[PDB]
Amino acid sequence: MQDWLTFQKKHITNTRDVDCDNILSTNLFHCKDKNTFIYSRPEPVKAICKGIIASKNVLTTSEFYLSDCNVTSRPCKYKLKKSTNKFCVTCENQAPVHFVGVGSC
User: Fold this and answer.
1) Which of 34, 27, 22, 20 is nearest to 6 (CA)?
2) What family is reported?
3) CB neighbourhood size of 57 (10 A)
4) Dihedral sign, CA of 14, 16, 21, 24?
5) Is 36 annotated as a binding residue?
6) What is the CATH number of the domain that holds 21?
7) CA–CA dist 37, 21 (Å, integer)
8) CA distances (Å), 3 to each of 9, 16, 31, in order?
9) Is 35 annotated as a binding residue?
10) Are 61 and 105 in contact, with CB atoms under 8 Å apart?
11) 20 to 30 A Cα–Cα from 69, which one of 12, 22, 33, 48?
12) 34 labelled binding-site residue
């Protein structure tokens, strides 16, 4: 439910330029306040949780290329934020199931 499958579509992007406008206006996001996407494949991101079976929030050993879509002054209209930082993923069954935050946990 709140697991890697849902985590992927909502956080795993393969482009630095995620079009927040269209992508976030789907029912998958429904234009919430913001959404931090990770520019990296699901494999190297799932590998962060490699060996973590028990639900455990872990902070990454390095920074990743993040693209954060955040709402502007207008609802469902976003500003792209391209940055590089670490992030804490809640690892369960060797897969990131919940997103904690960027920088540290």
Assistant:
1) 27
2) Belongs to the pancreatic ribonuclease family.
3) 16
4) positive
5) yes
6) 3.10.130.10
7) 14
8) 11, 23, 20
9) yes
10) no
11) 48
12) yes
Q: Tell me which residue has tokens 């369960």.
A: 92
Experimental method: NMR
Q: Max CA-CA distance within the chain?
A: 42
For residue 32, say whether it is annotated as part of any ligand binding site.
Answer: yes
Rounded distance, CA 99 to CA 5, Å?
Answer: 13
Specify the number of domains making up the chain: 1
Strand partners, 69: 35, 80
**3-class SS of residue 6:** helix
What is the secondary structure of 2-60 as a DSSP string? -SHHHHHHHHEESSS---HHHHTTSTTT-S-SEEEEEES-HHHHHGGGTT--S-EEEE-
Range of the structural domain that residue 73 is part of: 1-105
Query: Which of 62, 99, 104 minimizes the C-alpha distance to 84?
Result: 62
Helix (H, G, I), strand (E, B) or coil at 28: coil
Which amino acids are annotated catalytic?
11, 98
17 is in an annotated binding site: no
CA angle 94, 90, 45 (to 5 degrees): 60
Tokens at 19, concatenated: 């079009």
